[PDB]
Amino acid sequence: KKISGGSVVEMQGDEMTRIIWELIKEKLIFPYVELDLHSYDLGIENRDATNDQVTKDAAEAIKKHNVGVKCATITPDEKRVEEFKLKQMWKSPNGTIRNILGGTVFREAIICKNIPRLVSGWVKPIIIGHHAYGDQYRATDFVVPGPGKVEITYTPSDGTQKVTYLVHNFEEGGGVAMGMYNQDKSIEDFAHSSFQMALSKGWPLYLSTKNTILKKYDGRFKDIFQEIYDKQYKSQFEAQKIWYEHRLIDDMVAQAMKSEGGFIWACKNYDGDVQSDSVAQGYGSLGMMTSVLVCPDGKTVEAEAAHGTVTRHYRMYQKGQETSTNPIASIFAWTRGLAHRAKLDNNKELAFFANALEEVSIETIEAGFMTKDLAACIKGLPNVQRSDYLNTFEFMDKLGENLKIKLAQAKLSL
Amino acid sequence: KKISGGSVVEMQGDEMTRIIWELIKEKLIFPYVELDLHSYDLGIENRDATNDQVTKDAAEAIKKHNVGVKCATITPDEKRVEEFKLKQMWKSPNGTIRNILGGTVFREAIICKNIPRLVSGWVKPIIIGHHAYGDQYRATDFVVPGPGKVEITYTPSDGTQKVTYLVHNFEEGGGVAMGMYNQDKSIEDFAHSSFQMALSKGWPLYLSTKNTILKKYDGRFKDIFQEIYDKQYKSQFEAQKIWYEHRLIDDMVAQAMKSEGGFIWACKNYDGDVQSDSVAQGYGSLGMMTSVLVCPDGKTVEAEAAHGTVTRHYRMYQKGQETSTNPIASIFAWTRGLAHRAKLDNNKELAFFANALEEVSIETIEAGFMTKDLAACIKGLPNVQRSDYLNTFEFMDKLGENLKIKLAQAKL
Numbered sequence A: 001k002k003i004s005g006g007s008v009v010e011m012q013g014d015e016m017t018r019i020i021w022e023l024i025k026e027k028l029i030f031p032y033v034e035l036d037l038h039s040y041d042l043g044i045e046n047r048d049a050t051n052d053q054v055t056k057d058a059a060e061a062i063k064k065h066n067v068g069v070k071c072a073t074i075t076p077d078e079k080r081v082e083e084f085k086l087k088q089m090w091k092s093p094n095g096t097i098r099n100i101l102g103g104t105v106f107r108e109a110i111i112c113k114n115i116p117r118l119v120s121g122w123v124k125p126i127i128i129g130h131h132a133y134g135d136q137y138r139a140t141d142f143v144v145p146g147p148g149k150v151e152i153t154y155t156p157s158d159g160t161q162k163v164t165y166l167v168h169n170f171e172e173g174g175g176v177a178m179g180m181y182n183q184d185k186s187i188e189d190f191a192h193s194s195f196q197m198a199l200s201k202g203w204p205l206y207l208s209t210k211n212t213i214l215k216k217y218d219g220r221f222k223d224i225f226q227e228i229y230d231k232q233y234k235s236q237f238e239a240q241k242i243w244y245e246h247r248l249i250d251d252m253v254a255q256a257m258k259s260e261g262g263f264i265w266a267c268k269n270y271d272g273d274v275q276s277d278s279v280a281q282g283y284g285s286l287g288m289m290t291s292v293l294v295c296p297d298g299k300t301v302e303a304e305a306a307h308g309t310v311t312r313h314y315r316m317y318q319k320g321q322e323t324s325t326n327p328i329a330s331i332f333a334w335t336r337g338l339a340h341r342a343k344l345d346n347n348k349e350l351a352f353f354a355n356a357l358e359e360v361s362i363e364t365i366e367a368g369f370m371t372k373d374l375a376a377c378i379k380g381l382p383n384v385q386r387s388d389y390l391n392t393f394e395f396m397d398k399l400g401e402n403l404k405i406k407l408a409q410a411k412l413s414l
Numbered sequence B: 001k002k003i004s005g006g007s008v009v010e011m012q013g014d015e016m017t018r019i020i021w022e023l024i025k026e027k028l029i030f031p032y033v034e035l036d037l038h039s040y041d042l043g044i045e046n047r048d049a050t051n052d053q054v055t056k057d058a059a060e061a062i063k064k065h066n067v068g069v070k071c072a073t074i075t076p077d078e079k080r081v082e083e084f085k086l087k088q089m090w091k092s093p094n095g096t097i098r099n100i101l102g103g104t105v106f107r108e109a110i111i112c113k114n115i116p117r118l119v120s121g122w123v124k125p126i127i128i129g130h131h132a133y134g135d136q137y138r139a140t141d142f143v144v145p146g147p148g149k150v151e152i153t154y155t156p157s158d159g160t161q162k163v164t165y166l167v168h169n170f171e172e173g174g175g176v177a178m179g180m181y182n183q184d185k186s187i188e189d190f191a192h193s194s195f196q197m198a199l200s201k202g203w204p205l206y207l208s209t210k211n212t213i214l215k216k217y218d219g220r221f222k223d224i225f226q227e228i229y230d231k232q233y234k235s236q237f238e239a240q241k242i243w244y245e246h247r248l249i250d251d252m253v254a255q256a257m258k259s260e261g262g263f264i265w266a267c268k269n270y271d272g273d274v275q276s277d278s279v280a281q282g283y284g285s286l287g288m289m290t291s292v293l294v295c296p297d298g299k300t301v302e303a304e305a306a307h308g309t310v311t312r313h314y315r316m317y318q319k320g321q322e323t324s325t326n327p328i329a330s331i332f333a334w335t336r337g338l339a340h341r342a343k344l345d346n347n348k349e350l351a352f353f354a355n356a357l358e359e360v361s362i363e364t365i366e367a368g369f370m371t372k373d374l375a376a377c378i379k380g381l382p383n384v385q386r387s388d389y390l391n392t393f394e395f396m397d398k399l400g401e402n403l404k405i406k407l408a409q410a411k412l
């Protein structure tokens, strides 16, 4: 440890990403960077032991220190309750954190020149901002056990009126029902971040909704974006020869699929969650994408890997079999977090380190050293041989070597 | 107008699809087929005129006659209300029809061997069955004007305690809120249709949900599928060497993107709606896809194009400008409906005709006569010249001749 990093909130995860997380710290961060590290273990076991209170604490710590880096976590269902002998099916730690912090989640592929895409046309990046607050992650769902009436009601805080809407009358048998909601202020912040991101990149902005189907719910997003565009941002867009356009999600996914890339895609929370996986895989790997939650203040960020804990690879790890799991997304959670840390503190040595590690990661892959997913992009999956890639440790070690070299050359330079 | 078709419900649409619809009847269907045809105009003007009653009437007619073919329709938002001077913002006719009929919507790309895909890997078809009932199409959404409590309650029919849950307490400002629901029986029918489709195609089946997030709501879909699989179709799958698996939707879309295709994808209503467009475009055009609603009765069917009315091309049509818009999906709405009609009536002539029109459509494109979208698939869009594609009228004409030849050559 030499560079003085400052205050960072670290959230430990589960399964294969927890393995990779420790390797990143040991071989990449800790040798070169001293951090005041506020560490919260979001491993499923510690969440169960704390009644998921560690998750709320971690989110409050991020508010305090303005940067956090999160490892992927298990969101348990019934099967996970049985697997770990959990007390309850805990809520997604990502939902909990994003709903405490608010803001927009920006996701973008990590491009290496030698890696063929699955989608032939994307020669420019697609950047998905997605609203981080509300909707399905805050929803209230339940089983309808039998016949009866489901209603949803709104009571203003003065208690002077009540509006009851019929959801469904279940005449025969049961089913499921759910309420969900969003807030105007959170929607307004989301539009601002989306418009500002478009201007920062010089790219057109598209917002996707279902507003033809949900006329009030999605119509509110469409209206808030349009009001804020026509008032504040529309001339700035024209000055850069870019535009803002609302599209139906149906049209939007087809346009993106056939596009060349090079646009900002504003998504509702659920669409951004799902489409970012399609996009990341389309550029060739879920392991090559960045995800940063940018809070409305412009000060606080949470960087993360958007993919999951890679359970299938973890099961092989548990048997001693070789794994090749792409660490790049998890590494970029650290570099994006430290880069923001550096900016807040005007720390040039940290800013240099964060970019250096990003450069090493891409250069290493472009020199032919990669995990199996990326070799599968170059070859076909059925054509890949063991000699074509590196196991998770071998790849981390190669990154470690090249990082030491790159930082050694920087010190020698000038 | 020789072959006797039987009874078919026709639903007329809007904008560019409406133009193509009448061309298909004139140049393709009516010369070779006589039908007992119950026509319902779902064009946005007639729906307004009838206060949407025509949409429910058409759905009731499909229940009666077991087959319908639907042109794409406008679902109005505020901008459409002003455009057409509408009385109300009408609900989607597709939502209305699907929730009356129930069942599963099956969507599959129409493959021409000369058309390159956007997605490198898919050499086998992807069939999305999607639940036709409930969820977002049946939702109750509203604006929250200001601070206050939104709650959701369940009052059982047995007189027992009413159950109340807090949705959100808005502490400052307003927002939006929505209820939505689904029914056990509809989910069970959706499960059975999915398992049977996989066995009939010999392909593995995947169900995608968000059940880690919606634990009760999406958990019910996952539990019902798993229960019906274990007790009913499991041994049949193993005999055919296929399998059923639930995946989270995040994993599923990425798995699908990198696959070679060749599976049935069971989706919830909203996911199937959206993913079907991404899959159709990935095989290279929104114009090449079949969409067939299969009702739980095993009898009734509604065939449609899954895409919209193509407003942008319609606006150019309104200016007298040349357009190239892909009719194939609107045509396959006709062929799929007639094919089902022919199966119900055991009409071997109608069945032959329906297949022939499909073969003609594919063979025409495979010969190099295609609309602009398909030309763009081959050459890339910036490289497409005018000599590479036929305009919408030209393309319909070329299909009409190849059809006339294919049936005359079959007269032998």
Ligand SMILES: NC(=O)c1ccc[n+]([C@@H]2O[C@H](COP(=O)([O-])OP(=O)(O)OC[C@H]3O[C@@H](n4cnc5c(N)ncnc54)[C@H](OP(=O)(O)O)[C@@H]3O)[C@@H](O)[C@H]2O)c1
Pocket: A071, A072, A073, A074, A075, A076, A094, A286, A287, A304, A305, A306, A307, A308, A309, A310, A311, A312, A313, A324, A325, A326, A327, A329, A373, B212, B247, B248, B250, B251, B254
């Ligand atoms: N950000 C988050 O905290 C987050 C997000 C999503 C899911 N999860 C959680 O993760 C757990 C597992 O979910 P899941 O199995 O649906 O999905 P997953 O962990 O994302 O992995 C599913 C598949 O995606 C591929 N993959 C994902 N990340 C990869 C990487 N870094 N390198 C190489 N391949 C990668 C692998 O494909 P192959 O099998 O073909 O090799 C893997 O088997 C669940 O408990 C879920 O709740 C967490």
Ligand SMILES: NC(=O)c1ccc[n+]([C@@H]2O[C@H](COP(=O)([O-])OP(=O)(O)OC[C@H]3O[C@@H](n4cnc5c(N)ncnc54)[C@H](OP(=O)(O)O)[C@@H]3O)[C@@H](O)[C@H]2O)c1
Pocket: A212, A247, A248, A250, A251, A254, B071, B072, B073, B074, B075, B076, B094, B286, B287, B304, B305, B306, B307, B308, B309, B310, B311, B312, B313, B324, B325, B326, B327, B373
């Ligand atoms: N089944 C239905 O009744 C249905 C389904 C969806 C939407 N709609 C309705 O249709 C209206 C417009 O929707 P939208 O503009 O979002 O999408 P759309 O009408 O489906 O088409 C939008 C874009 O998709 C491409 N496209 C769709 N069909 C095509 C075809 N047959 N041939 C060539 N290209 C095709 C065109 O791309 P390019 O612009 O690049 O040429 C078009 O501009 C709305 O009122 C909506 O409610 C109806």
Ligand SMILES: O=C(O)CCC(=O)C(=O)O
Pocket: A074, A075, A092, A093, A094, A095, A273, A274, A276, A306, A307, B212, B213, B250
């Ligand atoms: O939190 C979860 O359960 C999944 C999160 C996810 O898929 C995402 O953030 O893209």
Ligand SMILES: O=C(O)CCC(=O)C(=O)O
Pocket: A212, A213, A250, B075, B092, B093, B094, B095, B272, B273, B274, B276, B306, B307
């Ligand atoms: O009914 C609508 O408004 C849209 C329908 C749609 O996009 C679909 O059926 O896939």
Ligand SMILES: [Ca+2]
Pocket: A273, A274, A276, A277, A306, B250
């Ligand atoms: Ca996701």
Ligand SMILES: [Ca+2]
Pocket: A250, B272, B273, B274, B276, B277, B306
């Ligand atoms: Ca659709």
